[PDB]
Amino acid sequence: NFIIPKKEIHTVPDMGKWKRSQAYADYIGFILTLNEGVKGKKLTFEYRVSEAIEKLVALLNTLDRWIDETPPVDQPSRFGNKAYRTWYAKLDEEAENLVATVVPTHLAAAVPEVAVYLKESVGNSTRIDYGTGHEAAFAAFLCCLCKIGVLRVDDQIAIVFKVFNRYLEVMRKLQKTYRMEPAGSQGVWGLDDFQFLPFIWGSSQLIDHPYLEPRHFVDEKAVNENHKDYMFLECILFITEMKTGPFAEHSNQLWNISAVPSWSKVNQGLIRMYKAECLEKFPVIQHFKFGSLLPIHPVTS
């Protein structure tokens, strides 16, 4: 009974049925389920790695590879490099074939439904840009795999620390390689040019840290010291690799968050901020796709 996920949020009044959709409930609970699973734990933690995780990292590694197979054009050019479209096209042809390496045959029919989210998670071919709208789809991608029991509860630490963490390395690579633009006003009032979720699961990691306080993440010296262990700081280091000038100028919203007393409170301030600035923002989220695994119909309870 699987189906090709389709667009359901066409107008601003549509945000209602979204916020009462099964999908919505499914999505956020999934978000918080993983958020809790990562509490106080270093990236170097000993977690369950399952063959499905291995096959996903391999899926992502193919994506990484195609970038190398598709070097940026040498044209003049001034925004996103147009070799991104050549990359994206390779994915559009090959998303199904790829999800197929992770999905058992008795669930063949789900491949098309599942692959859609995959195709929506890497940015925009026309505009060569990327934002939390696409990030969301990669989470929704992963949720679907839980919904069909390809991914397991036992794995929900390796989803963040291994798979999503690799996905982030691949996104950054696309962002450096093809000089991708932030999607819409991600680079105006945004927490970040590109991501959001890693700041959630990142600050969750640092809950109850002995030495490292939210106020410490603006200290670059200290960031270099600790990025290998923590998802939140890796994000920070990436910003400081991409932006001219002083922190408070280029990432003011994060700058103000560093003032927050505890990682616990940051993580509460972000869960909320993620709802408002992203999941409940028409412009960011209207492209979210709705099928059988994450449907639009009213929450059944």
From Swiss-Prot:
Expression by tissue: Widely expressed.
Keyword Isomerase: yes
One protein family per Pfam: PTPA
GO molecular function terms attached to this record: ATP binding; metal ion binding; peptidyl-prolyl cis-trans isomerase activity; phosphatase binding; protein homodimerization activity; protein phosphatase 2A binding; protein phosphatase regulator activity; protein tyrosine phosphatase activator activity
Major localization listed first in the record, in broad terms: cytoplasm
Matching Gene3D superfamilies: 1.20.120.1150
Result of altering residue 249 to A: Abolishes interaction with the PP2A(D) complex
EC assignment: 5.2.1.8
Localization, UniProt: Cytoplasm; Nucleus
Resulting phenotype, residue 260 to D: Impairs interaction with the PP2A(D) complex
InterPro entries, per the entry: Phstyr_phstse_ac, PTPA_C_lid, PTPA_sf
Result of changing residue 115 to D: In PARK25; likely pathogenic; decreases PP2A complex levels; impairs PP2A phosphatase activation
Catalysed reactions, as listed in the record: [protein]-peptidylproline (omega=180) = [protein]-peptidylproline (omega=0)
A GO biological-process term: mitotic spindle organization
Domain of life: Eukaryota
Family: Belongs to the PTPA-type PPIase family.
PANTHER family: SERINE/THREONINE-PROTEIN PHOSPHATASE 2A REGULATORY SUBUNIT B, SERINE_THREONINE-PROTEIN PHOSPHATASE 2A ACTIVATOR
Known disease link: Parkinson disease 25, autosomal recessive early-onset, with impaired intellectual development: An autosomal recessive, early-onset form of Parkinson disease, a complex neurodegenerative disorder characterized by bradykinesia, resting tremor, muscular rigidity and postural instability, as well as by a clinically significant response to treatment with levodopa. The pathology involves the loss of dopaminergic neurons in the substantia nigra and the presence of Lewy bodies (intraneuronal accumulations of aggregated proteins), in surviving neurons in various areas of the brain.
Subunit-level organization: Associates with PP2A heterodimeric core enzyme PP2A(D), composed of a 36 kDa catalytic subunit (subunit C) and a 65 kDa constant regulatory subunit (PR65 or subunit A). Interacts with the catalytic subunit PPP2CA (via C-terminus). Interacts with PPP2CB.
Name of the protein in question: Serine/threonine-protein phosphatase 2A activator
